[PDB]
Amino acid sequence: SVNALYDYKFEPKDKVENFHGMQLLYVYWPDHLLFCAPFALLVQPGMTFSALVDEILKPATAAHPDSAKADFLNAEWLLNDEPFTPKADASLKEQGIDHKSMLTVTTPGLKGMANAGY
Amino acid sequence: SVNALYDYKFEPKDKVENFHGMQLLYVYWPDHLLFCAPFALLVQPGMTFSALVDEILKPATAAHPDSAKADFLNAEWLLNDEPFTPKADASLKEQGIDHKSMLTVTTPGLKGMANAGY
Amino acid sequence: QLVFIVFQDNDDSRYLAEAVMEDNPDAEMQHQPAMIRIQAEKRLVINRETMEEKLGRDWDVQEMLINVISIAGNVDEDDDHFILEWN
Amino acid sequence: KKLNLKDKYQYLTRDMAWEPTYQDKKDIFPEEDFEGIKITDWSQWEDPFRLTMDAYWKYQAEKEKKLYAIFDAFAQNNGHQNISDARYVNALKLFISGISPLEHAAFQGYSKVGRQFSGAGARVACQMQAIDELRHSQTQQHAMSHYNKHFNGLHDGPHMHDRVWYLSVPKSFFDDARSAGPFEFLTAISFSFEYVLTNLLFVPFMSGAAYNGDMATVTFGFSAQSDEARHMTLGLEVIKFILEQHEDNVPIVQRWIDKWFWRGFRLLSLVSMMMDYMLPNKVMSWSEAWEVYYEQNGGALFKDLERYGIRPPKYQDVANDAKHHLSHQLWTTFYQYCQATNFHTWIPEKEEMDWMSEKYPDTFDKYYRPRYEYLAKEAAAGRRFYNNTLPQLCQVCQIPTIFTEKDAPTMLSHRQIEHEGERYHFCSDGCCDIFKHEPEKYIQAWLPVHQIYQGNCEGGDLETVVQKYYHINIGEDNFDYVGSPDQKHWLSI
Amino acid sequence: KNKKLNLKDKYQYLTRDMAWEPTYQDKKDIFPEEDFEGIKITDWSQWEDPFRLTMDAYWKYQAEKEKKLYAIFDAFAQNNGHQNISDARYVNALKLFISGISPLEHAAFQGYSKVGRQFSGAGARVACQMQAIDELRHSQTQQHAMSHYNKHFNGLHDGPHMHDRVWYLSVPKSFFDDARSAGPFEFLTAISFSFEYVLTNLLFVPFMSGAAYNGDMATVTFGFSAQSDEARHMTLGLEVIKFILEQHEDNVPIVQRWIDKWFWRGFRLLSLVSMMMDYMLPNKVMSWSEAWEVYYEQNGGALFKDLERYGIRPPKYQDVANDAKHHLSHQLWTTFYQYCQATNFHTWIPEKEEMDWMSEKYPDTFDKYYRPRYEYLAKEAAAGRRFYNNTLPQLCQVCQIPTIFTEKDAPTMLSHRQIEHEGERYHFCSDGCCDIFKHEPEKYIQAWLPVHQIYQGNCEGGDLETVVQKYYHINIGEDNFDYVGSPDQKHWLSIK
Amino acid sequence: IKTNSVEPIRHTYGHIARRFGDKPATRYQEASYDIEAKTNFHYRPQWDSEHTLNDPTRTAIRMEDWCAVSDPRQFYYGAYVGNRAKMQESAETSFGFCEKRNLLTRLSEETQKQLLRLLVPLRHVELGANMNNAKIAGDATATTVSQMHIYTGMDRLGIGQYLSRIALMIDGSTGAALDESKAYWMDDEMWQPMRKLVEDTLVVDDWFELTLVQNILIDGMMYPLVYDKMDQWFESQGAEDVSMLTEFMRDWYKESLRWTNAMMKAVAGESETNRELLQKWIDHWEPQAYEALKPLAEASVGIDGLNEARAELSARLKKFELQSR
Amino acid sequence: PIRHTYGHIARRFGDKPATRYQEASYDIEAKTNFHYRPQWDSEHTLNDPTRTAIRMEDWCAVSDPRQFYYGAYVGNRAKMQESAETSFGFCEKRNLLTRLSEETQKQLLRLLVPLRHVELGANMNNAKIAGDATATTVSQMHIYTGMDRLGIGQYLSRIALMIDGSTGAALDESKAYWMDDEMWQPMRKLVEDTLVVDDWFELTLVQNILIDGMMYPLVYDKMDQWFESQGAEDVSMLTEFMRDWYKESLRWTNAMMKAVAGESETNRELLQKWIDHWEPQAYEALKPLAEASVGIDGLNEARAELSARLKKFELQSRG
């Protein structure tokens, strides 16, 4: 509880309604801090999980030398810190990937560089 | 001539009396500007000319290429601008080489470096 | 614990440093950038009476204020002093 | 009888106010009750400094004459050619877009509160503080003004403060304080910021500029803080006053102390990077600088405070561990994003890394030297790395979420909650707790990344936003120090 | 009512009207000095004030100026501005300065304080005392300016001491003693007019703007803050000879005389500056030749063009001096080169893009006469045989500079001159120096020649080196010798 | 003196360049224009439901460019504190001198009374003026405008200290005169209409309606009444001597005209809309000002004093195209 | 840093940072090896310590408590002149002097404004001193005081000009008293005689100690309290500057008497010789003005102090 001198109540600036039928997805790829922070991606709610993987994440992780031999589609995922199993052909939205959820994608056997998660 | 509030007379500071039994001599060697200016020599009225030329003048000129192949003594000399011809084993005093005279010794055939009298 | 006070590494500040060194048997100086830092245990002080017998004229605290970058501590301000400290 | 200095200043000050008979006290001062603070007796209030206008004008003016002679001479004499290296000006690019606007937001803040407090003592102190801030603001515009003429990225400071991603770190900080009521404002800025971390921000830059030949910054930085001495002893003197004014204020004060230290601390992180990296001649590891300046000098003053029933700030252990990591994390962050910054970044030199291995004996060679090795190969191969995809920002500090869990440098300390149906994300527990106390506030933030994607920063590219919205000249203010127009110019001397 | 006073008139009532015809003492005992030079002053109350600052104005302007300059001195020192100079070679120009030029500041404070008592016109008195205390300002101010360099470099630590004693400093020490010993019309003429007007830029701009082009902030600030001072000194100078020429026809030949004298003494003093600006400033401002050409040949040309109307003509031998702008600096530098075992600053061979410059400013004389010198000297130094001349030079009885100067149109012949007087011989750098001698031979035979005094044993030591260390205070190995090897150079290579 | 120069990349900053052209600009310019944050605020004020942080609409007055208001005096911070340092010194001279020479403590009890009831009490007005200008400095968006209010509010504090100090000189640093005087302010019927107006202004929302009332309407008449009219009259009342303690006020007032008229002019000349606003406020507010001063003229130099200051301020409003008298 | 200060300073106060006053004031003067002898003086040399019979081991034992090097002198004076400038603005504008009766104006134009004349005297004296005394710390204090006197002339002269609407006529008037009025003739002859002393220390004594030690207190204190009763209290405001100037002059003049007189008892008796001779003439020059004013038990009260503070150097005068 905010203290204010009137009834302090405001719409969130980040409502999905403000995004021209797109949504925010975040993706954390641990052990790849080459990328300083999880991505903020702007995605279609009706694209397939597969398409995300191919059309957005391969590109966003390309610059890391693990990216090429990673098998994102088949790696360990969490959706909002909960274990999650991607369905390759469901729309993101249709399998609970909603606006501003974060996927975490752990690749088994790729832990970046030096022995530094880089 | 000087203007002053009294009779303005003074003993010169450079009277031969002041030099403890010695005298001053100038020697100028044309075309050898490496030595920016004629030498000022604190000399014995007594010593001979040859002497002066070997004990003093020659060392003083050492640093110059020509010092070596010059035969000061058999060069043309000037005493105080007047043509002059020196008595080798005569004292300085006695041949008229007094406190503050200047010998010019010109050395023809040795006229310094790079056609710049240096 | 240690209160402190930076001054401009100045001409005037030599004298301001001085006076603080000499009526703070313990304060410890240390130099740096272009500045004097001075800390010490729980407390420092700045008598007008010091300073005056070392500049040959009266002076008040408030002149000092000119040359101080930073302080550190609770303030005890006067016509006679500048005490800086913890209870 | 005949007044002491203490009473004669009061007569010159507090005794000009009076008890209102024609309007209600509470109409004339309507901001002092909502926050939950309670004031029994504004006369307890003890004016730390005792200045009268005559004395205020006289001394400040004497500072100014001196201060502008130097600025003028610096200019006249092209003293910018004397800086250790053109890399250094980048600290100043971060300075004028990120910090100077805070001097202005202070001036606004304090003017306001300088009206709101019902104690005549507190108002004059605020009023002067307020006028000092404006002096900070102008003198810097004046200092930086020579640097703007010869180097890139200082030519739209304010315009950038309001739009550029990373600058909502500082913009939202003060927006938080100024949207707040007057004591939180005073506890956040006078106390938390101005007293506790003031140093941790002035001293890094100021002594820095010392070592790197920059007379104009130091000149100001310095002379511009005989003020901060006053500005501090108001911070101090006002929590002491607030706390001991009512038992009840204590836990509200505490909450504040918690919130502002964490906000404070996260905004400080920017300095960390700059001091370890944009100072060609080094001065003191952010780490050293924190230990002295916070852990000690600070941890000291929270001592003189248990007497009033207050603990040190929550998560302070996090921020003490953080010191081994901050600068490396923030700098590699900016490195990879400086296509959207008014300033350059680069790989440190061999000797800078060695200093770094030395000052950061436990962290550097393990976690951050191999970053620069790798980045260097990429660059020499013709692939200088720029990350082409925006980051997740922390809903509160607004910094990208690059921080690591305490003692687990390879994991981001990510956090999330749900509030009224909506998702939000945080850098830390510190940032998260502050959200949970006041959600109806932070759900308002204008997070730059979001807004670029709501398409509200006037481009569909990042490249176009950067150019037309931020006014950043692509190719000029932008990109690695190597190949920059700054490099070309410096190098030709 | 009656007329309100106008500016001129108001200023006179606030100065001149304070004075008055004495009744209990004779006028000439009160002002005993105004006759022996032979200058007749017909009417004092026809005097025109060169400037018109009352006290409260002076103090107000000068305080505000001072405040700005000590802030900058303070800052400069607190950031170690000395580290931004272009290169430590430049500091030798400051060593030469504070030993050479700066004590002249003080001899002026001294001289104008006197003349500011001895003139019968109350207004000539205030202009002078005003100048007096300006010169004291100049003197103190330079001392502070220089304080920080003194702490980081050699050569600057005993200015006043060396000024009275070190050979080459006797060039300016003697200049001033010449003038201060003269009577007060001649002092005004030598200094206000001759030095402060005709020659002032020729000495001021090269140091002042040298510091600007060489990263010397504290010295250029001193300069800027001195401009407004010089503005007044120059007007005093030009008013006052106009006034003297005007107050009688017999004044004319006497003033001409003083003009020829002090132009020539000043040209000679200046030669130290010629060298300073061509050889000592790592970054160049302009050649000595362009500096002569502009500030003397042109400005002075015009100045004299205006005084023709008083039956004054341009100074004897100016054609010698113009012909010498192509040589002066190179002649001076080789002299100091070869005797810097005895100076309190270093010398060195200049860089090749310095020589290229010199070739370019002296297309008629550098490559013919001077560049060969450095080619030779550089060979010799490479061979561990860096030239030092161990035999003291003949000095000129008037300018006291070594007789290094050459015949106009013959740069290869020393222009020596020699006279007898009272069965004593004396020697001269030039016709000019000779003419000054013959005109006042009883003055100059009193000269303390440094070389001469060394042989008299008057300089505590029997070897040049002993003199240098004990009498001169010049720290052998430290203050001394080529730049290369010097403590200053090493300390500069650390710093960078 | 020859200096070395450098080709500069640009001459000023983009905001200044946008506003005044690509040439070098003045100190005042770089210190005063487009400096503050203007848009994209992060959270709405908890202490105002009506307005964002930094909101032009905290006043009913509109302008295309609030920058159209500028200091004729050209004060950024240094220039300001510089000017004031010079002034406060003259004042210090005069105060030393009134003291060492005992020129107020020598006056008759009845005369000193006059000072205590006729002058000193304005410090309460000056305190009011200070808070009102702080409030404006806080609400007005453009630095050119806000800055001016902070300077003047500070000056309000200063002037009331001087007034306060005439009393300490009279009671010799006991503070009993301060007390006698503060009772007149609270209690004497002559000061109530004034006290009432001042407190009423402390509760006005619109920062411009505030500057208008305070800095144009109240000051526009008080200073002429007090520091000119009642000042000459003092001589007739055997208190010439004070006048050297009020010089700061005359000088301050002459200078205020310059900025206040500038601003009034710009704002009023901006639109027929702004004009109706000022006028509506003038009609409500100046009779109140005249009223608040009216007892102070009765007890003083007389009502003509008031009517002429009333004229004086009426000629000022005319230049902006507004009316009172 | 190689060293802390310049050698001549290091030699006098040790090798450590020296004060601004120190680097400006000690051992900058030319001292020895002068090149020619003055054409205007047969007895002495350039920069000659014997132009006074007084004898000092080290003149630098006379240094200045106010620590004036040029910069601190002007910055101090700047502050003072500002303040008087306030005064004069105020008088002028409230017509404080013009409004007075013509007998009172005459009183100011007769007992007060003519001092500009003594001031002119002092300004010449001091110039002779400052160019005579060898030690910079001495000579500087003299050029300062010199210029102060002119500026003080300048104020007195400004009194006149306010009165005559800046026409001069009040100067003309006043100067006439200076020349033809009985009361000024002792004074005016006293001054004209100091213009002819040769020994520069005899001259500082007469002028800076004897005359000033008496006329200052007489005029700018006593005469002053007396103006009140004469209907002229309002001029006091334009003579503050002369009051602070004097209070200050004491600091330095006392310190140079303590040093010159503490030196060598054979000095204490060169001075004594001279106090006997002049103090008298000073007292005489002051007497008329005393009786045309606050009346002789001013003068006395003032001789009183002078002989007083003299005693502190073990000199005396009489009474």
Ligand code: MOO
């Ligand atoms: O004098 Mo007071 O302390 O303000 O009432």
Ligand SMILES: [Fe+3]
């Ligand atoms: Fe600030």
Ligand SMILES: [Fe+3]
């Ligand atoms: Fe602050």
Ligand SMILES: [Fe+3]
């Ligand atoms: Fe000079």
Ligand SMILES: [Fe+3]
């Ligand atoms: Fe000059």
Ligand SMILES: [Zn+2]
């Ligand atoms: Zn955060």
Ligand SMILES: [Zn+2]
């Ligand atoms: Zn010569």
